[PDB]
Amino acid sequence: YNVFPRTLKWSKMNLTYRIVNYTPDMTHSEVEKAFKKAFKVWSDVTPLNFTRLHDGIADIMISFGIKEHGDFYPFDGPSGLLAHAFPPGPNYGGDAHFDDDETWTSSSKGYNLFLVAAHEFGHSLGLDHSKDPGALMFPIYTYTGKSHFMLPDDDVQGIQSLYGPGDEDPN
Ligand SMILES: COc1ccc(S(=O)(=O)N(Cc2cccnc2)[C@@H](C(=O)NO)C(C)C)cc1
Ligand SMILES: [Ca+2]
Ligand SMILES: [Ca+2]
Ligand SMILES: [Zn+2]
Numbered sequence: 001y002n003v004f005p006r007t008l009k010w011s012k013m014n015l016t017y018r019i020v021n022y023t024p025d026m027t028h029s030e031v032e033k034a035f036k037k038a039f040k041v042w043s044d045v046t047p048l049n050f051t052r053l054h055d056g057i058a059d060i061m062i063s064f065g066i067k068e069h070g071d072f073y074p075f076d077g078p079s080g081l082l083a084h085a086f087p088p089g090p091n092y093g094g095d096a097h098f099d100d101d102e103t104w105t106s107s108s109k110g111y112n113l114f115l116v117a118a119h120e121f122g123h124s125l126g127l128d129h130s131k132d133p134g135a136l137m138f139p140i141y142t143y144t145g146k147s148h149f150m151l152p153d154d155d156v157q158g159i160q161s162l163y164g165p166g167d168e169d170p171n
């Protein structure tokens, strides 16, 4: 049973994460919405368990990425790359990093963390992608997390069904 390596949705009904998008044009209050609110929408599509244990137990997080890997250069102006997320494995999984050279906000101008973040998190915690037809995963985001409707049902029901109940049980 193996074909397209894109799903990672089975044994992860609950996970922890950290909120630290950035403080460019928004304030601690906005980032609070970006990370929380965007999470409110992600939870709306799927009852995913998320906990930010500052104690040091986080798997995914929202934060502006700044070239710190050592392989490919993510940050790069408005280039085709606003949010790169990693697989929830080591302490660098579900790492939601936005091309620091891009723009992010919680208002009607630019990428709304609700959208971008709900999208990056959907990846960092979800998997490679899941919107062939239409979901909050393609390089297009136009409709904010809630600026019209769940057009991207692919990500809505997609993770609402795959990330819904977790298994983490080998038969
Ligand atoms: C809200 O929907 C979107 C979220 C994030 C992006 S992105 O960060 O610009 N980007 C999409 C993309 C850009 C260029 C080429 N291919 C894809 C991310 C992404 O997919 N994040 O989930 C890339 C860098 C992986 C776009 C829309
Ligand atoms: Ca870019
Ligand atoms: Ca991590
Ligand atoms: Zn990064």
Ligand SMILES: [Zn+2]
Binding pocket: 119, 123, 129, 136, 137, 138, 139
């Ligand atoms: Zn995507």
